[PDB]
């Protein structure tokens, strides 16, 4: 279980919420996005 979880599943949870986007108007507007990549474990 633990090895399977560490190897495969742990990457999944990162994937489903990797990105969150933020936008604010101007006076053309601008928008900000933060995204997650591969997971690395020491």
């Amino acid at each position: 279980s633990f090895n399977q979880f560490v190897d495969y599943t742990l990457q999944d949870i990162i994937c489903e919420d990797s990105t969150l986007i933020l936008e604010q108007l101007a006076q053309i507007s601008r928008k900000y996005e933060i995204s997650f990549g591969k997971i690395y474990v020491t």
């Binding site: 990105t19 969150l20 986007i21 933020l22 936008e23 604010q24 108007l25």
Partner: protein
């Protein structure tokens, strides 16, 4: 009949037809024109729109930084086209629907004016149903009627 240990050394002891050439139709129309599959549930033999009626018209029918739910664009674009396709006269009626099960991997064999074919995939599929042919509906009286 008891346990054993000394069997190991035994292992050491054991040791006509119509060829129609094809070609993908050019892509500029594919940008402008999207092709889909039409289907009916009339149970009719053909149910051709030729016999349906004339005319025919088929068409669909200060805040700060904020956490917004996400969605893949094609679904998001598909989220926006929620208007049902409707063909009418100005009296028989037809309304389509999305199936999303077999619009993915299909390329059709258009047997064109020439014997050869242009092979065309399907962008979408739609399920048009004959509706209101008997033309009865009680959307408002139903709530009262259910008490009898």
């Amino acid at each position: 009949f008891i346990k054993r240990d000394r069997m190991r050394r035994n292992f050491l002891r054991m040791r006509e037809y119509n060829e129609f050439p094809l070609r993908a139709i050019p892509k500029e129309d594919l940008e402008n024109m999207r092709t889909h599959l039409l289907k009916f549930q009339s149970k009719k033999k053909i149910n051709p729109v030729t016999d349906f009626h004339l005319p025919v018209r088929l068409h669909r029918k200060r805040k700060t930084r904020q956490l917004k739910v996400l969605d893949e664009n094609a679904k998001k674009l598909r989220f926006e086209e929620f208007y049902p396709w409707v063909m009418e006269d100005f009296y028989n009626t037809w309304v389509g629907s999305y199936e999303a099960g077999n619009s993915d991997s299909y390329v059709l064999l258009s047997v064109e004016d020439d014997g050869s074919f242009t092979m065309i995939p399907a962008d979408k599929v739609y399920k048009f149903t004959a509706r209101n042919k008997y033309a009865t509906l009680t959307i408002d009286e139903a709530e009262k009627r259910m008490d009898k």
